[PDB]
């Protein structure tokens, strides 16, 4: 009955500040209590912010105290959260969780706690570096890589911060046996991905395949052919 | 502040059979006015965590009624009965008392797949990776588990470890497997001097280690 | 806002027969024990007062039916309902129930009644919403489910609320409230009464001296009206609205002649209608 709307991605630079927004719809912002929950990547869930239906105050995670503030625009139904002096270890997905402040009717009052609806997340990223294009290395098949029950075929992309991308390995034609990972942040502060799709073996030799390496913030929509080698 | 835990940190269950996740605490979670506050969040991969049995033993709206809460005081337990697909993810058990909340140590479940054999594919550095200033070799191991497995790089046969970062995929839906990759990182001066490149994998699911490679260039 | 709702059900509006109801003081004169006749508008006795069902429950499982349609104002309306829980709040008399014409709105808001005459922009199914505010820690009653915007208002009267309940007798009372609205020559007069009752459902047999509450110098042109319900938010109980169960009786005035009998105290008693039968 409630819908929460997120606020898109935000790449930033260390030392700055960042403000994340969350639009409610279905109920009004003056009867829900917002809690913000980080998701440091490949890890658990961490609490900060929140709201005490009691005392109305808005507690602040000791871990982030004197470092974050939270304000509420009740007119346009959005809540805001401002994290400041961003260190290197704050790249996370930031969830906008909520519940209903009480429970029942106009006759029965239960101050209710918890999180009920979770709103889809935004992805901030601190990085002391800038934005780079591609480094596409088309991983060419092989002798016994192909000619089996299924083949394998991929492209190799290193040292880049274009953020997202896609892969696909074609124009919506390939989708069988492709295994992807969760990129990574090298020690220098760059990424490194391998997307090697186990394609069928019978199709190669008559029609080679292409990785569509499209870097929408870098706008380097390079589409490299991967001739079997 | 509270700081509970979990129990199976996994528990790849079977089809059609019940399952049991066990929570724990380090306080008494009975909030004043006597109602304890547990919840059992279910998070799919790449999605927000939804909700399931909140407030100890209840059910949330639209939860398809296979889920059951139990316990009291300090021990708690979720129990699914006759599981199927569409229940695979992570099951946190948040508390909600003593302001600074805290979540469960996390607990992933999945399908109970037998210890099958992995499959090995290797790939060398493309021709424009040969002049890139830094090349790479991948170890496309297919089908395996991330915890009891083992992926080893054999840069031209010579066991060379310590310079690698690992990326493993999720489980498949048609097969519920587990892809595995590794990123050997060495200098440009080292990557040219060679040819017979191979990746040798040893894992509990394989009788003998695999060994699939590629000859630099050729057809 | 403007969350439409209604369904479709309605069946045939249950009819009934008020025996002798709706005799308002047709002036501001104090009088002794005499016999007074008056040509005015009244509800004719033994009429066919329609019995509308608001939120309507059915023996089987939950099921709530909504059906407070707009009705014709004709020349005057005898409105009555029992309603131990204050779920009727007020009425929205008007012409088009939109902008380009004015509209009268009476809300109760049980600490203070307040009346406005703006160019409102009502939803097609208006009602008051009740929620919780998370500051002031108190269930407020925001009215923006009724109208979108309210501009050009040319009046605003505040006053102790009409629907003052009492009960405090765990039943046997049921407190039948009546109202009669009539609109002539640029005025708006309301007459009221609160009466204890013990009959099962319908109208009793006695006499009610509906004395006037207010008179409003408006001049608005009225030809269609509706009634306001106070629905609250449901919360963690498996739209999220629809309090209680309610019903009210509506019946329209006609110009007739009555022969009212006054007390020695100054109150009416038995009213005789010339027009009912030949004996009358
Ligand atoms: C029943 O209806 C009454 C009429 O609307 C409400 O009474 C008034 O509500 C106002 C806010 O809703 C109060 O504050 C006023 O707000 C306006 C906004 O801009 C100011 O101009 C006014 O100066 C300000 N008034 C004061 C005295 O500060 C009014 O005070 C209040 N009036 C009274 C007599 O209470 C009731 O709130 C409403 N009942 C409920 C339960 O909501
Ligand atoms: C409150 O009621 C008012 C009464 O009608 C409305 O005010 C009217 O707005 C019109 C514009 O929308 C004005 O039109 C002007 O008309 C004169 C002659 O009629 C022309 O010469 C002007 O060019 C024309 N102006 C424009 C900008 O078109 C009306 O004069 C004006 N009425 C009065 C009495 O001033 C308001 O619109 C209404 N409030 C709201 C919020 O709608
Ligand atoms: C009061 O408003 C109504 C409009 O609802 C006027 O009544 C008639 O309305 C119908 C539409 O239902 C029109 O077709 C008629 O032309 C209206 N009657 C007349 C005589 O024009 C009514 O006229 C208005 N009263 C005043 C004094 O303006
Ligand atoms: C109004 O009429 C009633 C009864 O006809 C009178 O009210 C009674 O007044 C006496 C005072 O001597 C009380 O003991 C009774 O209990 C009253 N009864 C009721 C039902 O009120 C009254 O005298 C009349 N006159 C007035 C109120 O001016
Ligand atoms: C319901 O209300 C909407 C406007 O909110 C309107 O567009 C729609 O036609 C209405 N349907 C019915 C059956 O009333
Ligand atoms: C009231 O009106 C209905 C219309 O269906 C009619 O059947 C009934 O006889 C009427 N009753 C009286 C008392 O006029
Ligand atoms: C109620 O809320 C209003 C503003 O919404 C505020 O001015 C007023 O002081 C509050 N009253 C209490 C008792 O909290």
Author numbering:
A (entry chain H): 1 to 229
B (entry chain L): 1 to 219
C (entry chain A): 14 to 251, 256 to 297
Question: Anything the authors wrote about it?
Answer:
A key target for therapeutic antibodies against severe acute respiratory syndrome coronavirus 2 (SARS-CoV-2) is the spike protein, a trimeric protein complex with each monomer comprising an S1 and an S2 domain that mediate binding to host cells and membrane fusion, respectively. The trimeric S protein decorates the surface of coronavirus and plays a pivotal role during viral entry. S1, which consists of the N-terminal domain (NTD) and the receptor binding domain (RBD), is critical in determining tissue tropism and host ranges. The RBD is responsible for binding to ACE2, whereas the function of NTD is not well understood.
To investigate the interactions between 4A8 and the S protein, we solved the cryo-EM structure of the complex at an overall resolution of 3.1 Å. The S protein exhibits asymmetric conformations similar to the previously reported structures, with one of three RBDs in “up” conformation and the other two RBDs in “down” conformation. In the S protein–4A8 complex, each trimeric S protein is bound with three solved 4A8 Fabs, each of which interacts with one NTD of the S protein. The map quality at the NTD-4A8 region was improved through focused refinement to a local resolution of 3.3 Å, enabling reliable analysis of the interactions between the NTD and 4A8. Association with 4A8 appears to stabilize the NTD epitope, which is invisible in the reported S protein structure alone. The interface is constituted by an extensive hydrophilic interaction network, and the buried surface area at the 4A8-NTD interface is 832 Å2. Arg246 on the N5 loop of the NTD represents one docking site, which is stabilized by Trp258, simultaneously interacting with Tyr27 and Glu31 of 4A8 on CDR1. On the N3 loop of the NTD, Lys150 and Lys147 respectively form salt bridges with Glu54 and Glu72 of 4A8. In addition to the hydrophilic interactions, Trp152 and Tyr145 on the N3 loop of the NTD also interact with Val102, Pro106, and Phe109 on the CDR3 of 4A8 through hydrophobic and/or π-π interactions. Therefore, we speculate that 4A8 may neutralize SARS-CoV-2 by restraining the conformational changes of the S protein.
